Amino acid sequence: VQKQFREFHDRIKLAQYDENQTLRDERDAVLTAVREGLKKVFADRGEAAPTFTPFNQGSYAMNTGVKPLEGGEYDIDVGIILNIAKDDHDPVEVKKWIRDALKDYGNGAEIRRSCVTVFKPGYHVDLAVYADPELSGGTLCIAKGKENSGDEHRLWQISDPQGFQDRIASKLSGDDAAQFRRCIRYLKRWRDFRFPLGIGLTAAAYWWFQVSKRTDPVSQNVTYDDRDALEQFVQTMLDNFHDTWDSKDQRSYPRLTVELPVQPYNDVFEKMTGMQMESFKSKLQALLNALKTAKSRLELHDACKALADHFGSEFPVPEK
Ligand SMILES: Nc1nc2c(ncn2[C@@H]2O[C@H](COP(=O)(O)OP(=O)(O)OP(=O)(O)O)[C@@H](O)[C@H]2O)c(=O)[nH]1
Numbered sequence: 105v106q107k108q109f110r111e112f113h114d115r116i117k118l119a120q121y122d123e124n125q126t127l128r129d130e131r132d133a134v135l136t137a138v139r140e141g142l143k144k145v146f147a148d149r150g151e152a153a154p155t156f157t158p159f160n161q162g163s164y165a166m167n168t169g170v171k172p173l174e175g176g177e178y179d180i181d182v183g184i185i186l187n188i189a190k191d192d193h194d195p196v197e198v199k200k201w202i203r204d205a206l207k208d209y210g211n212g213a214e215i216r217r218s219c220v221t222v223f224k225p226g227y228h229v230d231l232a233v234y235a236d237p238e239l240s241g242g243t244l245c246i247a248k249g250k251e252n253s254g255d256e257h258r259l260w261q262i263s264d265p266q267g268f269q270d271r272i273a274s275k276l277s278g279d280d281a282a283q284f285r286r287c288i289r290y291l292k293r294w295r296d297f298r299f300p301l302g303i304g305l306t307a308a309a310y311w312w313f314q315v316s317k318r319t320d321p322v323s324q325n326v327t328y329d330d331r332d333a334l335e336q337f338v339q340t341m342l343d344n345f346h347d348t349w350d351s352k353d354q355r356s357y358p359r360l361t362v363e364l365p366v367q368p369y370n371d372v373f374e375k376m377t378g379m380q381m382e383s384f385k386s387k388l389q390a391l392l393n394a395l396k397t398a399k400s401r402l403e404l405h406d407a408c409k410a411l412a413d414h415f416g417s418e419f420p421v422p423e424k
């Protein structure tokens with residue numbers, strides 16, 4: 105079922121910031137809009153505008169991006185580093201700046217725990233907001249907390265977005281890397297279809313993903329098993345679930361822990377409730393049964409037909 109996974113990949117992959125003129129524009133369209141919006145806010149105050157360094161983030165930066173489904177949204181992720189001290193301003197306050205700036209932008213802007221989200225026709229931009237490392241003691245620090253949140257969970261947390269993008273790019277090379285990237289995209293479309301924060305699956309793959317190839321010693325021509333590579337990876341993930349008592353709920357929930365391989369090394373999955381976590385393992389187990397099925401049991405049509413319960417109506421199914 106490889107040539108089907110390769111077709112699937114071609115259908116779902118979305119060109120990274122570097123190879124995607126039209127995504128740089130919708131990113132630029134929002135940065136240009138911030139600076140302009142920052143004049144309309146930091147003039148009222150009496151003080152001068154804060155200046156920021158933007159940079160690319162997330163899957164569009166790491167070449168692991170997929171095209172949204174219909175009635176889904178492109179997820180454009182930029183960081184912005186403002187020249188301020190982390191020990192002077194308040195994380196949400198600083199995010200408040202960004203929202204009001206983009207108020208008159210698109211369908212408006214919401215403050216999230218780890219970014220300001222802003223909306224538009226058929227996409228959104230998440231803007232992670234950092235304190236200057238120079239004014240802040242040498243550590244890059246992301247603004248954590250929502251308008252509705254306490255002060256315990258108002259933080260300036262040590263971050264390494266470029267470090268993380270780096271681990272993903274560095275994991276393997278050539279066609280072993282290319283297999284790794286195809287498998288992240290497959291599971292993202294699965295996420296998009298049947299909901300496992302894409303970072304979650306990306307961190308998971310960094311740790312657990314193993315290449316599935318057969319190398320012809322005589323012909324020195326290698327052949328990739330994308331199907332088997334996913335079954336092995338998904339099994340490893342399921343395997344790594346541990347039953348986890350919730351005393352509030354007086355019930356056990358299964359739970360997968362995946363530490364970021366860069367600072368702060370948090371469990372990326374830590375903000376999924378034990379409820380969220382069990383229906384994540386339910387779907388993962390459903391996905392894995394389909395992947396086993398496709399290796400032989402069923403013939404190409406019913407094989408592919410199974411996968412499409414998991415991967416969606418863009419998974420190619422041959423007619424029977
Ligand atoms: N430190 C930290 N950074 C995170 C976390 N979640 C997301 N990020 C960062 O924010 C970026 C965008 O997150 P997402 O949009 O959820 O994921 P993605 O890797 O871009 O993949 P998609 O699912 O295709 O959007 C990630 O690539 C990270 O750099 C987290 O839990 N901790």
Ligand SMILES: Nc1nc2c(ncn2[C@@H]2O[C@H](COP(=O)(O)OP(=O)(O)OP(=O)(O)O)[C@@H](O)[C@H]2O)c(=O)[nH]1
Pocket residue numbers: 161162179181215216217218219230232246250265375
């Ligand atoms: N740079 C960075 N981006 C993050 C991080 N966590 C999440 N994101 C981004 O923020 C987007 C929205 O996710 P969250 O910030 O977790 O959203 P939320 O609903 O406020 O979070 P909860 O309060 O946990 O429900 C994701 O799509 C990511 O792109 C993080 O630690 N670092």
Ligand SMILES: [Mg+2]
Pocket residue numbers: 162163164179180181302
């Ligand atoms: Mg993203």
Ligand SMILES: [Mg+2]
Pocket residue numbers: 162179180181230
């Ligand atoms: Mg996002």
